[PDB]
Design a binder for this molecule. Structure first.
Ligand SMILES: [Mg+2]
Ligand SMILES: [Zn+2]
Ligand SMILES: [Zn+2]
Lengths: 140, 56, 46, 56, 69, 19, 233, 147, 32, 115, 266, 391
């Protein structure tokens, strides 16, 4: 429901790789000097250039109400209000790895259908993330 | 190191980790004596021959 | 019918290698026209 | 070798094989004429008296 | 052995264009491509029907009829 | 690039035009 | 071909010239009034020669006349070909494509194939369906398969012009897509158009002839061609 | 079979409205699998199809003799002059839905031969039948209702 | 063409081949 | 020899109905409708029109085997909306769109004078 | 009116080239498939041979006769033979043609489809006539006779659709295109060096604006504005192919509605 | 029928055509093609034989072969190519096609998975939809070269609770290989679930490849101009090395390797140079090939073809060998009457510098014909002798 993580990242570099629709961006946080993100982005739906300021948010659910996927996805109805309305690019995925980079730095790995991100930083801001499913909401 | 052996221990370990949701942060309920004795009695339970003499 | 009328046969108990396509077969028998079976190389076509 | 170790048998069929992605792994697509030729002798039971009567 | 009635791929009737195809070649002195395009065969599926046809009925008609009335 | 066509009717016509 | 000294040009050249070629084409188009110039005319004038495998050991043969005979930018699409760097030829190949037999001469671009595939096609060309003879209606062969609509190939070899393949073809030009369409063409299967089949694609005639004779074993043991009746037979 | 050792049986028959179609409405008479190409290294099948496409479009029968100076690039230039993609690919559409296939399909005429192996001359079954006089086992041969 | 003694090309030799099959045929060895 | 008759592609046999609606136990308010003697021509049209219905959560069709002219259409709608009514609405909208297309084509053809 | 829009680009006797706009991909493809396979048409279905001294087989001639395009303008007035109460065929469900050809000339006598003579009572309908397209006035070349050869036969033509047999198909080749600029990205263009240079532009690219090559990909855009070209075999006019295809698709959907109501009432 | 998996028990489905129909995955244990292959059926006539036929000889029970303790049935051919193309990172599926895929899985539970992309368009990845066919509780982990928990090349494999995390699904995952998905599913879930997995994967991948398409053509065998120039330079420098070794041998300056004569050492050096030339030219051609190359896609999927096929079709056929050596002097001191005497050049003794695309010269054609004839003879002899050995 609520925001597990939210930060503003500046895109250091964008690597297209051998793909035509997916580019792997590497970005660093502006507020924190040692939290950074590596993330696969469908760039036809959401074009990302270098030195772009992206607000990146992780949530456990999209609805504005608190939590009480096992529920079947349905197309969004007219008048449906969610957190996705406040952002430009929403992905859904699974946390599949929690590693400790150092004595303080941990890295969380998420898989949105095969689009991977690694988000690392120490635990006073990444402790909300646990082994569950999460939404990644990105706005420019 | 890699040799053909019957029971894939690694798959059973992963199935136990994902079945009981091992968070690898909470301390374990296992005592060490229980682990050692359990491994030992498991070794005594791996029966291929059921004879009750010294040769078998 | 045309291939059957230009077909040759080599009867095979020697120590040679009559099944392989020889160098001297250039322009005299077809380099690739032979049965896939036990008659491979022994049955040749001009 | 030709009559005891191996032999020609009844209740057998042979035709060309073709691929079918819509069949199961353990399914064979049997031609209807081959199905009408090959038979299975089913013993009449109370559980299949009606179905075997309909087949007759 | 005789010209097919319809194109195999698409079904265009090409059997009525065979006798006019021969006239475009022998007395109009056209090459085969212009003769095919003149008859309206613009798809190569139709062009191969007339262009590659062999008129074996002409060889079959040289034999005397077995039942002659 | 050589022409990849067996065009023997037109060469027969040309040779008869020489004759 | 015969390669002579040819001191007029200062280098080795084929004895056959454009005049002999013109005479051969004049005779050929007469066959379809000047002097008849045939293959034996080429043989008797020393333009061509018969060489067996024993005599082939003592000669040097050029593959092509216009490449290996005269003394020496290139297209990258063309195949790499050497000129052998030697001018002492005694003979020239009439055409290298005549190393192939009857069945292999049907194959289009056999030099662009793997050789086992050429062998497999030379085997399976005898199993095809066409018009084996134009008098099949008056022949009572045991088995005969005749295509309804034979077509000459769009891609054809020069050699099959002498094999009468454009006159008695053994196949059809099918519009072929190379595609993984439905999964029903996997492992050498193919998806045929049913609508094309309905219009006569690869539809064939099949003839089977049954022979029967009435033989006289003796006086009373003789056979008779008759319609039998259930009462007395 | 094609003229290149590419033999095979009919897996299924589709009607015209189910076959894939080009933008010109041309449907194949035959669909063969791509996986028959690379392991068998049958390049001449592809060149024959390309040359036959150019031959049908131009009306001149293709010269497919072995040791001539006919390259793939010349056939490709001639095919591009006719308004088609030079390597024989065509934008094809799915016949079931009308949507364009994401991959373009190699497309063109190819000479195919009907071999004498029919399924109807080879399909065989026997529940019970005549036995041999000697061994009293099932007889041999489908023409004798054999085993 | 215009020159009677000009050297032939690879195309011209097919004419020679035609002459061969205008005299021998494909079953010349059996008949001979 | 084993070839089926071609009219079995479009003719209902003895004891066979055009539609056969079964409830689906996998998801609530979902049905599976078996269309006999039809193919992708009807199935794709019906499915793509059902996906334009706003109260339809799921619409899919499949031809389980190309040998048999039949397809299964699974429809799952929202609560309180009968999937049979969704099928009726999709069919009615297809009918109306096809009628408009027929009238438009007839008028545009009558505008043509070069035929 | 509101709904699918039609703009006819070209019209001929046997070709109509039109732009079908404001319509989904499924309905355009369903119309294409129905025109190909579902329009009822008259074609020769059974051949009864009396005399055949030609060089062609009886079954060869019968297969050629099935593919002869016959006039089918009033085919809806004709009945399916399976739905008719006659024993084999009659004027209500069939058209009976005859073909009598004799080689009385020294040269080869060509047997055309103009030699087919209707001997059944048409009841004033507009069916059964073989379609003549060429300027010579002859029809499809059916057979060839040398001197003394005879071909006497009787055809019964029954209505049917191309799903049963392709001889009943009036639709020839149907050109069907959409999005010539690949703005929906429904094709990933194979290329060697440049996809725009190596792939020739279609003729329909003039009817749509080219992409601006800086604009983002339009993920909300759907497939509409289909460029269709229907070609007629000749059995029905080329406009009647489209109209009868729309009618047949409408009748299929209405039959589904009718079956749904019939099992709703139970 | 060399082995026990070549005779297995199936279930009848009566079909209206004249051929036996069977799944594509079961053709590998049967060693069966569809170029005219025929297979025998046998009908048990009693309940005991019917029962022990389905409890011992059933196809799911023979998925893992005791011959090599690995699965003998796997995803093959079009399904393998389409399962590699489906599980690329670029492969995103729109809602209508996703629903059609989900309905094609027979044991799908009826819940639509949440898309990998929610906004601005609901898009499902191919891994996400293929994970529906994979049963829950299946965990697989394989690391290829350069594979980390982030996969920049999307190689390796990670499946957690039956959901694909990363990795393109290829022959290493759904092929007949040990430690693959087939092996893990049939050891953890049983043979019936593995047979259902075969069916589900085949259905969903075949539907996607039907509505996606896959082809191959002549243009897939063509490397561009700079690569062809580099290949020609590689072949030319190898011919220069062969000429240098030939000059050293003809000047008797070449030393003999131990255990072999001067001519044997010369032949070994020449064959080594020509083989490494063919390998280098093929590697250049393979590197030049794009990811959209269809032969490259089939090789990457492992469905058909290999590196040597790409090398021979595009770069260079290479040295032809008869009885393990170069083309022998079948004439007196020469291989063909078009060469001079004592010619040990690569073109004289059977090196085919041209690819199948460029076409073989007549001498190269004849030498390749000798190589193919030797291959066919060896194939027939090997089959007969191995049948003898097996009996
Ligand atoms: Mg086989
Ligand atoms: Zn056509
Ligand atoms: Zn009636």
């Amino acid at each position: 429901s609520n925001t597990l993580f939210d930060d503003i990242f500046q895109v250091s570099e964008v690597d297209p790789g051998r793909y035509n629709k997916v580019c792997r961006i590497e970005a660093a946080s502006t507020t924190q000097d040692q939290c950074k993100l590596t993330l696969d982005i469908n760039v036809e739906l959401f074009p990302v250039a270098a030195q772009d300021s992206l607000t990146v948010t992780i949530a456990s659910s999209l609805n504005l109400e608190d939590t009480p996927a096992t529920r079947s996805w349905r197309p969004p109805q007219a008048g449906d209000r969610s957190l996705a309305d406040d952002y430009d690019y929403v992905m859904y995925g699974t946390a599949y790895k929690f590693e400790e980079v150092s004595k303080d730095l941990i890295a969380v790995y998420y898989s949105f259908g095969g689009l991977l991100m690694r988000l690392e930083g120490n635990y006073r801001n990444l402790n909300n993330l646990k082994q569950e499913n999460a939404y990644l909401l990105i706005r420019r | 190191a890699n040799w053909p052996l019957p029971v894939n221990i690694r798959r059973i370990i992963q199935n136990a980790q994902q079945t009981f949701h091992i968070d690898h942060t909470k301390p374990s309920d296992l005592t060490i004596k229980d682990i050692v004795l359990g491994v030992k009695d498991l070794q005594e339970n791996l029966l291929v021959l059921r004879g009750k003499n010294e040769i078998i | 019918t045309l291939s059957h009328l230009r077909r040759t046969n080599t009867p095979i108990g020697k120590l040679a290698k009559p099944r392989q396509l020889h160098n001297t077969h250039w322009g005299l028998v077809c380099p690739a026209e032979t049965p896939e079976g036990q008659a491979c190389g022994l049955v040749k076509n001009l | 070798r030709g009559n005891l170790m191996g032999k020609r048998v009844d209740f057998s069929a042979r035709t060309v094989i073709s691929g079918d992605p819509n069949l199961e792994l353990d399914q064979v697509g049997v031609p209807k004429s081959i199905a009408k030729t090959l038979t299975y002798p089913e013993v009449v039971t109370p559980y299949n008296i009606d179905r075997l009567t309909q087949l007759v | 052995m005789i010209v097919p009635v319809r194109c195999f791929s698409c079904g265009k009737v090409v059997g009525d264009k065979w006798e006019s195809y021969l006239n475009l070649l022998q007395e109009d002195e056209l090459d085969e491509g212009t003769a095919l395009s003149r008859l309206g065969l613009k798809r190569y599926c139709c062009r191969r029907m007339i262009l590659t046809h062999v008129d074996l009925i002409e060889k079959f008609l040289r034999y005397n009829p077995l039942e002659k009335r | 690039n050589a022409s990849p066509f067996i065009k023997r009717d037109r060469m027969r016509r040309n040779f008869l035009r020489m004759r | 071909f015969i390669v002579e000294d040819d001191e007029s040009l200062g280098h080795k050249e084929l004895k056959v010239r454009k005049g002999h070629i013109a005479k051969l084409m004049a005779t050929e188009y007469q066959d379809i009034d000047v002097e008849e110039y045939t293959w034996s005319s080429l043989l008797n004038e020393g333009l061509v020669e018969y060489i067996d495998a024993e005599e082939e050991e003592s000669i040097l043969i050029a593959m092509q006349p216009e490449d290996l005979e005269p003394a020496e930018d290139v297209d990258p699409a063309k195949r790499i070909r050497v000129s052998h760097h030697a001018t002492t030829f005694t003979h020239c190949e009439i055409h290298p494509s005549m190393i192939l037999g009857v069945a292999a001469s049907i194959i289009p671009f056999p030099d662009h194939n793997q050789s086992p595939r050429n062998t497999y096609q030379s085997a399976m060309g005898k199993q095809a369906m066409g018009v084996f003879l134009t008098n099949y209606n008056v022949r009572m062969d045991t088995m005969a398969n005749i295509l309804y609509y034979p077509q000459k190939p769009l891609g054809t070899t020069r050699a099959m012009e002498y094999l009468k393949f454009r006159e008695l073809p053994a196949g059809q030009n099918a519009i072929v897509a190379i595609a993984c369409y439905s999964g029903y063409n996997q492992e050498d299967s193919m998806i045929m158009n049913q609508s094309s089949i309905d219009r006569g694609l690869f539809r064939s005639l099949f003839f089977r002839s049954y022979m029967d004779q009435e033989k006289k074993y003796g006086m009373s043991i003789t056979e008779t061609f008759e319609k039998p009746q259930r009462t007395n037979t | 079979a094609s003229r290149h050792g590419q033999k095979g049986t009919i897996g299924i028959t589709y009607r015209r409205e189910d076959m894939p179609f080009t933008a010109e409405g041309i449907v194949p008479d035959l669909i063969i699998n791509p996986h028959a190409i690379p392991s068998r290294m049958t390049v001449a099948h592809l060149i024959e199809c390309l040359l036959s496409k150019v031959a049908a479009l131009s009306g001149n029968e293709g010269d497919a003799s072995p040791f001539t100076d006919i390259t793939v690039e010349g056939i490709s230039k001639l095919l591009r002059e006719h308004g088609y993609q030079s390597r024989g690919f065509e934008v094809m559409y799915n016949g079931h839905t009308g949507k364009k296939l994401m991959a373009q399909i190699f497309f063109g005429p190819t000479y195919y031969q009907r071999l004498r192996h029919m399924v109807d001359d080879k399909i065989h079954a026997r529940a019970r039948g005549p036995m041999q006089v000697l061994t009293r086992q099932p007889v041999e041969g489908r023409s004798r209702d054999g085993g | 063409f215009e020159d009677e003694s000009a050297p032939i090309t690879a195309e011209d030799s097919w004419a020679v081949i035609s002459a061969f099959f205008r005299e021998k045929g494909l079953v010349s060895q059996q008949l001979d | 020899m084993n070839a089926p008759d071609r009219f079995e592609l479009f003719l209902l046999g003895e004891g066979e109905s055009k539609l056969k609606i079964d409830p689906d136990t996998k998801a609530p308010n979902a049905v599976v409708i078996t269309f006999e003697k039809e193919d992708h021509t009807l199935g794709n049209l019906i499915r793509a029109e059902l996906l334009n219905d706003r109260k339809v959560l799921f619409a899919a069709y499949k031809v389980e085997h190309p040998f048999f002219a039949r397809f299964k259409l699974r429809i799952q709608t929202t609560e309180g909306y009968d999937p049979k009514d969704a099928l009726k609405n999709a069919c009615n909208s297809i009918i109306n769109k096809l009628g408009a297309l027929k009238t438009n084509f007839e008028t545009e053809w009558n505008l043509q004078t070069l035929a | 009116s509101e709904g699918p829009q039609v703009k006819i680009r070209e019209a001929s006797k046997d070709n109509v080239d039109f732009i079908l706009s404001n319509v989904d991909l499924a309905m355009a493809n369903s119309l294409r498939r129905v025109m190909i396979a579902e329009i009822p048409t008259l074609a020769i279905d059974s051949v009864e041979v009396e005399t055949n001294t030609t060089v062609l087989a009886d079954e060869f001639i019968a297969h050629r006769l099935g593919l002869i395009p016959l006039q089918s303008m009033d085919i809806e007035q004709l009945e399916y033979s399976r739905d008719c109460f006659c024993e084999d065929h009659c004027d209500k469900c069939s058209v009976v043609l005859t073909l009598q050809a004799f080689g009385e000339s020294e040269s080869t006598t060509n047997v055309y489809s103009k030699d087919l003579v209707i001997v059944s009572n048409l009841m004033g309908r507009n069916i059964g006539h073989p379609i003549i397209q060429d300027k010579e006035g002859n029809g499809v070349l059916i057979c060839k006779l040398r001197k003394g050869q005879e071909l006497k036969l009787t055809c019964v033509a029954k209505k049917g659709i191309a799903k049963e047999h392709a001889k009943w198909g009036p639709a020839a080749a149907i050109e069907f295109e959409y999005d010539p600029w690949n703005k929906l990205k429904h094709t990933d263009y194979w290329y060697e060096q440049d996809s725009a240079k190596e792939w020739p532009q279609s003729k329909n690219c003039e009817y749509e604006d080219p992409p601006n090559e800086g604009d983002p990909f339009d993920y909300k855009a759907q497939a509409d504005t289909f460029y269709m070209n229907v070609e007629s075999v000749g059995s029905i006019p080329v406009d009647q192919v489209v109209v009868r295809g729309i009618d047949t698709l409408q009748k299929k959907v209405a039959s589904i509605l009718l079956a749904l109501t019939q099992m709703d009432q139970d | 029928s060399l082995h026990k998996m070549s005779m297995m028990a199936h279930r009848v489905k009566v079909i209206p055509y004249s051929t036996f129909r069977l799944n594509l995955s079961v053709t590998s244990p049967y060693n069966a093609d569809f170029d005219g292959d025929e297979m025998n059926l046998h009908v048990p006539q009693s309940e005991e034989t019917r029962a022990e036929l389905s409890q011992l000889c059933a196809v799911p029970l023979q998925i893992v072969s005791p011959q090599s303790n690995k699965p003998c049935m796997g995803i093959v051919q079009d399904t393998l190519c389409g399962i590699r193309k489906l599980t690329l990172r670029d492969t995103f599926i729109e809602l209508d096609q996703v629903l059609n895929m989900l309905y094609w899985v027979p044991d799908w539970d009826g819940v639509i998975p949440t898309p990998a992309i929610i906004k601005p368009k609901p898009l499902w990845s191919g891994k996400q939809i293929l994970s529906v066919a994979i049963p829950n509780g299946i965990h697989l982990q394989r690391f290829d070269e350069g594979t980390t928990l982030l996969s920049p090349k999307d190689n390796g494999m990670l499946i957690i609770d039956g959901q694909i995390i990363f990795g393109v699904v290829e022959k290493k995952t759904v092929g007949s290989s040990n430690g693959g998905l087939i092996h893990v599913v049939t050891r953890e879930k049983g043979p019936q679930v593995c047979a259902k997995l075969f069916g589900n994967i085949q259905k969903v991948v075949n539907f996607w490849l039907l509505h996606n398409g896959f082809s191959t053509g002549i243009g897939d065998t063509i490397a561009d101009g700079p690569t062809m120039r580099e290949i020609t330079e590689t072949i030319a420098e190898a011919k220069k090395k062969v000429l240098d070794v030939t000059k050293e041998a003809q000047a008797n300056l070449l030393t003999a390797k131990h255990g072999m004569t001067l001519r044997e050492s010369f032949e070994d050096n020449v064959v080594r140079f020509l083989n490494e030339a063919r390998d280098k030219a093929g590697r250049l051609a393979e590197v030049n090939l794009k990811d959209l190359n269809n032969v490259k896609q089939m090789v990457m999927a492992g469905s058909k073809g290999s590196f040597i096929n790409i090398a021979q079709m595009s770069a260079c056929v290479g040295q032809q060998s008869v009885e393990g050596k170069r083309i022998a002097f079948g004439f007196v001191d020469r291989t063909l009457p078009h060469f001079s005497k004592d010619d040990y050049s690569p073109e004289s003794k059977g090196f085919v510098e041209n690819s199948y695309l460029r076409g073989l010269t007549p001498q190269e054609f004849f030498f390749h014909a000798m190589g193919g004839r030797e291959g066919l003879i060896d194939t027939a002899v090997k089959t007969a002798e191995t049948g003898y050995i097996q009996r």
